[PDB]
Amino acid sequence: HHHHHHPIEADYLVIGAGIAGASTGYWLSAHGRVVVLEREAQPGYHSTGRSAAHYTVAYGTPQVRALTAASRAFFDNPPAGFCEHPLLSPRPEMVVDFSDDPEELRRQYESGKALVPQMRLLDAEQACSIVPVLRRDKVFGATYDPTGADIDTDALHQGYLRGIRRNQGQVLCNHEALEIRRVDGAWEVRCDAGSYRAAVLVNAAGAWCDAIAGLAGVRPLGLQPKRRSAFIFAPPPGIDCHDWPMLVSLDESFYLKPDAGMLLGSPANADPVEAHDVQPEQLDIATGMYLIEEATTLTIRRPEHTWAGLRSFVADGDLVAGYAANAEGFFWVAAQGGYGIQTSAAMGEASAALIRHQPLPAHLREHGLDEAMLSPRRLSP
Numbered sequence: 001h002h003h004h005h006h007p008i009e010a011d012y013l014v015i016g017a018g019i020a021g022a023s024t025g026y027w028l029s030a031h032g033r034v035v036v037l038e039r040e041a042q043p044g045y046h047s048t049g050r051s052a053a054h055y056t057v058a059y060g061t062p063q064v065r066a067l068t069a070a071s072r073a074f075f076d077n078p079p080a081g082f083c084e085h086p087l088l089s090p091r092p093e094m095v096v097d098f099s100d101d102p103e104e105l106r107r108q109y110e111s112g113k114a115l116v117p118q119m120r121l122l123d124a125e126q127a128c129s130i131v132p133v134l135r136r137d138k139v140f141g142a143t144y145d146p147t148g149a150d151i152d153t154d155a156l157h158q159g160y161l162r163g164i165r166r167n168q169g170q171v172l173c174n175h176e177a178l179e180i181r182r183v184d185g186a187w188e189v190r191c192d193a194g195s196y197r198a199a200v201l202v203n204a205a206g207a208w209c210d211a212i213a214g215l216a217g218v219r220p221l222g223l224q225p226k227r228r229s230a231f232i233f234a235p236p237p238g239i240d241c242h243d244w245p246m247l248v249s250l251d252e253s254f255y256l257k258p259d260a261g262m263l264l265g266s267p268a269n270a271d272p273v274e275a276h277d278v279q280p281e282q283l284d285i286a287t288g289m290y291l292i293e294e295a296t297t298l299t300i301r302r303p304e305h306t307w308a309g310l311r312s313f314v315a316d317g318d319l320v321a322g323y324a325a326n327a328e329g330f331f332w333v334a335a336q337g338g339y340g341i342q343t344s345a346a347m348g349e350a351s352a353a354l355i356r357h358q359p360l361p362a363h364l365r366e367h368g369l370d371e372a373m374l375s376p377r378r379l380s381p
């Protein structure tokens with residue numbers, strides 16, 4: 001009974017315009033008609049705008065580390081015209097043992113060194129020389145990754161979206177997918193003003209990927225969104241922190257990193273929650289501030305900014321890029337966890353290749369990636 005536009009035909013409908021949908025759509029867009037359907041009025045309102053992203057490697061898991069390592073080539077040397085300014089800024093990471101767990105510290109050093117030969121093992125004095133506000137009594141040693149970097153997430157994100165548009169793709173905000181149905185050989189998505197059809201449905205909906213499967217009648221993966229809060233605060237007068245590394249506790253109880261001339265802190269939490277527009281909890285912010293004030297001489301005045309975002313995982317902690325078993329044309333780009341920005345170039349290129357029934361590109365295979373490692377089929381016996 002209500003008017004709708006005539007349906008729009010495409011080759012791939014991408015649900016979600018965050019880093020997952022943008023990166024996959026970027027690499028698809030040279031090959032066919034891409035339409036990205038995004039619920040919000042902007043593409044980076046959810047997790048992709050909430051990360052203050054950092055890059056490493058040295059450290060998630062074999063699959064995560066391989067996706068991250070394979071992404072660096074694009075970040076450091078993206079195609080001409082992709083963006084105006086460098087995407088990465090140097091920002092070593094120092095993981096400090098505040099627990100007195102030398103065996104764990106040595107484990108993480110040996111493991112990181114295997115992918116990052118410049119990985120170093122520091123004693124407590126060396127850690128305190130690098131971040132001089134550390135309390136020496138609280139520090140037992142550290143690892144140091146000289147190769148870490150900060151990511152200009154908004155430039156990267158906007159570069160992917162711009163590339164889609166330059167290849168005649170569409171990025172449509174205020175286009176929540178409300179219904180999804182397999183109709184005459186295509187996936188057909190109803191948005192509030194009209195419908196969209198394509199042989200391939202690319203589910204890149206962040207914390208909402210299982211909700212999208214629910215609209216489509218496709219068995220979900222068991223994705224678990226987890227809240228992480230962060231805040232920005234001023235350093236004390238006389239503390240010149242702008243060149244400090246990313247500092248993380250060995251047991252991931254907190255982290256602290258410069259963000260320009262301010263400091264970013266976080267309790268590095270992972271509280272399981274439903275997919276929603278998540279807000280910071282006061283106990284998260286108070287805990288992060290408490291732990292920083294205990295580990296360092298800093299005292300924290302009232303934050304300038306607080307927020308939280310969702311880091312969404314499947315059971316094994318690995319990302320998912322692959323067609324659903326038994327659901328023709330439904331492709332998952334999911335379970336980015338805490339790693340969606342730093343893995344986005346390899347995930348985007350790999351997912352687009354697999355959607356198109358193509359082998360993974362050599363340079364990805366050389367970093368120890370294969371289709372099986374990415375597939376949702378591994379979550380089932």
Ligand SMILES: Cc1cc2nc3c(=O)[nH]c(=O)nc-3n(C[C@H](O)[C@H](O)[C@H](O)COP(=O)(O)OP(=O)(O)OC[C@H]3O[C@@H](n4cnc5c(N)ncnc54)[C@H](O)[C@@H]3O)c2cc1C
Nearest residue numbers: 016018019020039046047048054177206309339340341342
């Ligand atoms: C505090 C914090 C720190 C982090 N640090 C880092 C870091 O250092 N490095 C790193 O790589 N990552 C980091 N992350 C993780 C990173 O934020 C996520 O992995 C990444 O942003 C996930 O991207 P996404 O595209 O899957 O999700 P999102 O950006 O949330 O995008 C999903 C999109 O789908 C849309 N959508 C949902 N349902 C529908 C629907 N029905 N119709 C249409 N659109 C829909 C949403 O509106 C949203 O825009 C951090 C995250 C947090 C919160």
Ligand SMILES: N=C(N)NCCCC(=N)C(=O)O
Nearest residue numbers: 056059093248255311338339
């Ligand atoms: N880099 C580490 N070794 N751990 C710090 C995690 C930072 C991060 N990607 C996040 O908050 O999701």
